Design a protein around this ligand. Sequence first.
Ligand SMILES: O/N=C/c1nc(CCCCCN2CCOCC2)ccc1O
Ligand SMILES: O/N=C/c1nc(CCCCCN2CCOCC2)ccc1O
Ligand SMILES: *[C@@H]1O[C@H](CO)[C@@H](O)[C@H](O)[C@H]1NC(C)=O
Ligand SMILES: *[C@@H]1O[C@H](CO)[C@@H](O)[C@H](O)[C@H]1NC(C)=O
Ligand SMILES: *[C@@H]1O[C@H](CO)[C@@H](O)[C@H](O)[C@H]1NC(C)=O
Ligand SMILES: *[C@@H]1O[C@H](CO)[C@@H](O)[C@H](O)[C@H]1NC(C)=O
Lengths: 532, 532
Amino acid sequence: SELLVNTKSGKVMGTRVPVLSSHISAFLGIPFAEPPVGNMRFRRPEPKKPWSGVWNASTYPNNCQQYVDEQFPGFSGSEMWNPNREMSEDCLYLNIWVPSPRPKSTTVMVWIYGGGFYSGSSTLDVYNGKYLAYTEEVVLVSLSYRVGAFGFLALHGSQEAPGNVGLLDQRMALQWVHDNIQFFGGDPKTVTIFGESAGGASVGMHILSPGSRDLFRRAILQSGSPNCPWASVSVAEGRRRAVELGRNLNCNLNSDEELIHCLREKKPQELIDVEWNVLPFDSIFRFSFVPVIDGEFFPTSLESMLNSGNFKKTQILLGVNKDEGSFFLLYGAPGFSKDSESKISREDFMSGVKLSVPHANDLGLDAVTLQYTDWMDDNNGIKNRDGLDDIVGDHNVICPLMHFVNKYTKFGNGTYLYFFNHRASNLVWPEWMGVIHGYEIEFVFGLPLVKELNYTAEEEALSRRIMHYWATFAKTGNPNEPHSQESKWPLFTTKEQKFIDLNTEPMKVHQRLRVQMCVFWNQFLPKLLNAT
Amino acid sequence: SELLVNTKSGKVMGTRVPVLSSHISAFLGIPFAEPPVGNMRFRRPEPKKPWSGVWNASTYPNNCQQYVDEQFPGFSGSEMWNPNREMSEDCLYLNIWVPSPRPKSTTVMVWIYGGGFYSGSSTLDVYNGKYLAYTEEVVLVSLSYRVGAFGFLALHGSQEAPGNVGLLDQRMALQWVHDNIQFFGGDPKTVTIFGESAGGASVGMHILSPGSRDLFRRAILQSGSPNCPWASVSVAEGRRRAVELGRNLNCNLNSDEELIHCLREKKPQELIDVEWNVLPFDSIFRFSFVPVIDGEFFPTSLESMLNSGNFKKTQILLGVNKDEGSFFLLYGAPGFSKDSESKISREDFMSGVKLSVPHANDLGLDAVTLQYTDWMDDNNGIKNRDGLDDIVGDHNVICPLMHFVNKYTKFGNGTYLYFFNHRASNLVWPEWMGVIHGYEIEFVFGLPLVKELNYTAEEEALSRRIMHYWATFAKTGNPNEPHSQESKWPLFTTKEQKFIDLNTEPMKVHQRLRVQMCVFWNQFLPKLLNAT
Ligand SMILES: O/N=C/c1nc(CCCCCN2CCOCC2)ccc1O
Ligand SMILES: O/N=C/c1nc(CCCCCN2CCOCC2)ccc1O
Ligand SMILES: *[C@@H]1O[C@H](CO)[C@@H](O)[C@H](O)[C@H]1NC(C)=O
Ligand SMILES: *[C@@H]1O[C@H](CO)[C@@H](O)[C@H](O)[C@H]1NC(C)=O
Ligand SMILES: *[C@@H]1O[C@H](CO)[C@@H](O)[C@H](O)[C@H]1NC(C)=O
Ligand SMILES: *[C@@H]1O[C@H](CO)[C@@H](O)[C@H](O)[C@H]1NC(C)=O
């Protein structure tokens, strides 16, 4: 049967799902690890013991335990990102969409969800792999991984809570795809990993980690890169936050053993209730438990790895959105509101700068403020709002990504860079937020092909274009069809630094994406902070 | 007789000079001090002993001893600024142009020449007062003062070489005008002092100095202000340079008495031969012997005087030119040449930055470089050339002046601000130098009214406009004619910060002159340097 697949771990039974007036096979909730529950909380994942019988893979699995966004109850803009399945520590599963009839050996794409390493679900409507698998005839995988303290609590030196175990969750799913996707018609030698935000940083982290490089062919990173200021902490900061967490829960803090045992006795929501209290600064775009620079998953610092070429050399496709910052200002900066234009007073602007660069001294705040203030019109509330927007996105997403892309292209085998700046016509968020963090995903997964979702015909064309860029890149290492008459997406090179816009207008090619601000964020400001 | 005038110091006999197919009276080379020669070198000026008989005031006096520009022999662009009279330490004289017939009690304007406190002459063709005196019916005075070491060698604590004596030369000329201009038909209660560059800084310094405030009514500063980074040094730096000077001349350095006596034995050219060797940095737009913050002429620091309102409160007219920096880059920065377009390589740009901010550390140089580099086009040699031009003018002229004008307007009684950006049609300097430091003077003194000098009719109109703005301001404290139908020059206020362009086009009003760069030069960079 087409819905029955024999794997090295056992048989699985999928389900036939409709898609665009056709059908494909879906294998939902396949386990790839032992449930990381009980005494295994905070530990590295173990591989799933093979099973007898037929595993029912007809339904979506549980989502991992996470903080849940209640800032706008009933509002689809925020709740479409919340878990849409019961939460459970028993959450290490993956999902596969397979073209029908079953392919023999086809291109594989593995989706890694974002969410600041504190949240995320493989089961969201916007991650439904059936449109991409059907349209582009790829085998689409989405994995899952522990977030929050459950995935990233780091007590370096301990083997019970070493840190990075959510990254190892991802790697074990990658190992499982490598070992088993051939049975689903996937080609294990042509696996592209792709992800957005924390998932894009994750993709970059598997590019860097020697233990991960061999498990995939090429990589796509959307609005995230491994060197992002929020994506990792040192071993000392990870230890400090773990101890502060136990301090929030009245834990014996005498030893790692005491602390871990206390934290393992707590119910999941107890950890989530206090998770945000361990941040060291009054900040935005900073998350409590994230990957740790441990000398094991990451052999040395990220910057020295990037400088020495210590990373997998292959092709990469990556990009950013126009207004990456607006989401985080909405949720955490004074003066921003969902239902107003959020014109920003000068006081509020200064408050925003401080939340945005929480590690900066007062001279650093001044440097940032000078760089982003039109002093001919300092009380322009729209310029203050857009200026804060740019600060948050430049510092947290665009300029770290530009630093990564420039270090990587020196040693890599091909780079394609995009600037996604289409505001969707059916967007439920306010105008001022612009082209929001995460809102290219629905185009990458082909949601505008579904008529009931109220996109324009031009947006369907843009989605089909992006889906084909991405799958063609996954298949060949080049998003362009050979001998095609459509406009070509030029390679990004050290010399020319070309990129394209992604929108409903005819493709335009630019160079040196936001280079003025990224020189400030990547060269000048770190020098200023290190000297003062 | 109209050419004979009885003053408190004695009688003087002027000469009738032609001007624009008419005639006026000129009284040239009137002494206002004792010759500061011999044992008086470096000392405060003494007042001139009154004389018997009639002083022959028919000819221009000697110019003070100064370094002479030989960088372009025979080239009128540079030599029109050189002394055009024999040099002598016997040089403390002033010149008066008087309308004919002699007025009874008219507006007086006193010109103070520029030249970095190391050079300058009252006798230059471009300072000929006859056009302004004739056209606007003012009594035009030009004074002189010691420059170089002769005017500004500073051994604080010594009464033989206290410093600032060139400023006291200026003040004694002002005292003489106050005491005697009534006899020439001048009104001593309506004296405007005006000057360019070091002379504009000089004007600002008499505004600040309590010993000078009472000797004039109002003030005009052109491309110079008292707080300029080159216009003054501390008492310790003045002492260091004085000692280094004696070290260059094999002087006994055991005591101030030893040092001063040695320096007084030297011929003037011996001092001039080594004057440039005492600068502490590899710099441009820095001069060896300048005013010193002595606690006497200047009671406290300039910044605290400006903050507390400790200065004469009156009306001021001031402005800058578009390309103040190009002169100094031509003479001292690598890659700039009189006869090429001076397109500037990146290496040369970096060299220029270091010469321009010689007191900056490497982080400060980076801040400057970032502020003035278009990183989308970093190898644009024209952008590097114009960028260096702007750095030099912003840092040395425009932004210090903007700092002065903003501090002053808080306490003053009326400010008028101009941006002079007309390139003269007969300019002999290359195109790349633009609207050069000092090249508004010829318009202020009415040279375009002389047909043989090859200006356009529009330039004659601009000169007449500027002459009338200036004389009307000198007469009333407002450059605008009351109940006039011509376009009005708005007051500069703390709130609106309006200024005008001065060129051959219809007047345009702008606000916040070069405010973006001046926030960098006046707020951020000093903070950066003081913290690092
Ligand atoms: O990948 N997306 C993650 C993402 N994260 C945010 C930050 C929301 C964090 C809210 C934290 N608060 C802190 C105080 O306690 C309650 C929760 C905002 C937009 C985003 O897209
Ligand atoms: O007020 N004008 C003064 C002014 N000053 C300069 C600087 C020229 C200084 C040349 C100094 N050098 C230094 C080395 O020895 C020879 C002389 C350039 C343009 C100007 O307008
Ligand atoms: C698999 O699970 C679904 C939902 O729980 C159920 O409808 C279906 O019959 C199951 N298939 C089996 C048990 O073979
Ligand atoms: C990738 O590597 C191959 C050799 O393995 C080389 O021929 C090709 O030019 C490389 N492409 C890029 C874009 O570096
Ligand atoms: C004044 O000096 C000039 C030039 O030296 C001379 O021509 C003139 O006759 C003199 N007048 C006198 C001495 O009365
Ligand atoms: C100048 O001072 C007078 C009072 O002496 C005042 O009435 C006038 O408004 C002032 N002008 C300005 C521009 O401050």
